[PDB]
Design an enzyme around this catalytic site. Structure first.
Site, PDB file in Angstrom:
ATOM      1  N   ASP A   1     -26.099 -46.897  -0.685  1.00 51.98           N
ATOM      2  CA  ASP A   1     -27.160 -46.843  -1.680  1.00 51.98           C
ATOM      3  C   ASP A   1     -27.665 -45.416  -1.833  1.00 51.98           C
ATOM      4  O   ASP A   1     -28.002 -44.768  -0.839  1.00 51.98           O
ATOM      5  CB  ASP A   1     -28.307 -47.757  -1.247  1.00 51.98           C
ATOM      6  CG  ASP A   1     -29.366 -47.918  -2.302  1.00 51.98           C
ATOM      7  OD1 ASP A   1     -29.128 -47.517  -3.463  1.00 51.98           O
ATOM      8  OD2 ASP A   1     -30.447 -48.449  -1.958  1.00 51.98           O
TER       9      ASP A   1
ATOM     10  N   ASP B   1     -28.445 -44.104  -9.381  1.00 53.11           N
ATOM     11  CA  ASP B   1     -28.614 -45.126  -8.353  1.00 53.11           C
ATOM     12  C   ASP B   1     -27.317 -45.919  -8.210  1.00 53.11           C
ATOM     13  O   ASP B   1     -26.993 -46.747  -9.069  1.00 53.11           O
ATOM     14  CB  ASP B   1     -29.782 -46.037  -8.724  1.00 53.11           C
ATOM     15  CG  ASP B   1     -30.274 -46.866  -7.567  1.00 53.11           C
ATOM     16  OD1 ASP B   1     -29.511 -47.064  -6.599  1.00 53.11           O
ATOM     17  OD2 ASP B   1     -31.432 -47.335  -7.636  1.00 53.11           O
TER      18      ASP B   1
END
Ligand SMILES: C[C@H]1C[C@@H](N2C(=N)N[C@](C)(c3cccc(Nc4cnc(C5CC5)nc4)c3Cl)CC2=O)CCO1
Length: 332
Positions: free
Chosen positions: A35, A219
């Protein structure tokens, strides 16, 4: 000692990319989400006896000779979509692509609250954001890896390829076999997320954004692209859901607009076949309304499914000699 090394990423059945991470000594294997929209490292442990935690590789700290716990009762809790993760804090040794990371702080998932965890086979998170989103610990995971492996250059790039299962995370450099043309670098405005200033946003010929200051966040843990609620209303008035099949998908979307992001002199275009996804018999815009409250200035997310599937993204950490930058190129 591989200064440039590859961590293969496997697209799971849902909308996340996971890779191999070894935790402890003797090593225990977990497959966490890699992430870049968060910084903390979470690992699902055996203290979680829920069925959502079962049917997934669980890490047992009682079997690690290098696991150390502290007496400070620092309990961590993060919201994770419909569910939430709660756990304690500890330290152990990690290994990511034959590279050792000793004495690293991470979260131990002890409770999974709500069925999202059962669907995605959640085994942990490896945050790759900047320090400042670190909820616990002195040093983030990626920062600690570079410290203990000095030869590795402070950069990683994502090559996303979910259709064929050849997605990979390259750490330390870049390879021409993942991109084509030349990489355009963008300076990182604020070192929280991988944030970049956005100058203009065009839906076809209409300018929809950037009356006020706006930013772009890269992201790798968010599948769709996003825009603020105000611009999302204009987005859908021009872009509509339509019925489509795998055979007529190209001809139906031939009339659809091209979305243009303006980064100074750099223009990134998302063609309709690149931001439209087919589910059952309908083609829907891969866009969401999320209002990011971290900065009052509303921002835009570039995700894994729409943007990174077509663009090779480079995350260059700044040092004493260079600033932090995000580079984008056409995926090969
Ligand atoms: C400004 C950014 C921050 C983002 N952000 C993260 N990037 N990290 C966290 C850990 C996160 C939260 C929720 C979902 C996911 N990931 C995920 C995705 N998609 C599916 C499939 C099932 C639908 N499951 C899981 C993740 Cl990683 C926290 C978080 O808020 C969210 C968007 O705004």
């Amino acid at each position: 000692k591989e200064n440039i090394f590859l961590v293969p990423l496997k697209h799971l059945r849902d909308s996340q990319f996971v890779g191999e991470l070894l935790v402890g000594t003797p090593p225990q294997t977990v497959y966490p989400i890699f992430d870049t929209g968060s910084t903390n490292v979470w690992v699902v442990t055996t203290a979680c006896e829920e069925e959502s935690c079962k049917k997934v590789r669980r890490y047992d700290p009682n079997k690690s000779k290098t696991f150390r716990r502290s007496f400070i009762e620092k309990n961590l809790h993060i919201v994770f979509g419909s569910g939430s993760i709660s756990g304690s804090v500890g330290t152990d040794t990690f290994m990511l692509g034959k590279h050792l990371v000793r004495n690293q702080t991470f979260g131990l998932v002890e409770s999974e609250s709500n069925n999202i965890f059962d669907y995605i086979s959640f085994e942990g998170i490896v945050g790759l954001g900047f320090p400042g989103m670190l909820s616990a610990g002195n040093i983030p995971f990626f920062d600690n890896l570079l410290k203990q492996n000095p030869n590795v250059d402070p950069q990683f790039s994502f090559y996303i390829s979910p259709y064929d299962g050849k997605s990979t995370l390259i750490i330390g450099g870049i390879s021409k076999s993942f991109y084509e043309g030349d990489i355009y670098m963008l300076p990182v405005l604020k070192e929280s997320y991988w944030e970049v200033k956005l100058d203009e946003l065009y839906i076809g010929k209409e300018r929809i954004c950037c009356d006020e200051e706006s930013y772009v966040i890269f992201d790798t843990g968010t599948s769709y692209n996003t825009m603020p609620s105000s611009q999302m209303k204009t987005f859908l008035n021009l872009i509509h859901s339509t019925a489509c099949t795998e055979q007529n998908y190209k001809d139906i979307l031939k009339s659809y607009p091209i979305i243009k992001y303006v980064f100074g002199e750099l223009i990134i275009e998302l063609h309709p076949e690149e931001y439209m996804i087919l589910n059952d018999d309908v083609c829907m815009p891969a866009y969401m309304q999320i209002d990011v409250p971290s900065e009052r200035n509303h921002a835009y997310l570039l995700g894994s499914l729409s943007f990174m599937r077509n663009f090779f993204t480079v995350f260059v950490r700044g040092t004493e000699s260079r600033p932090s930058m995000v580079g984008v190129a056409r995926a090969k």
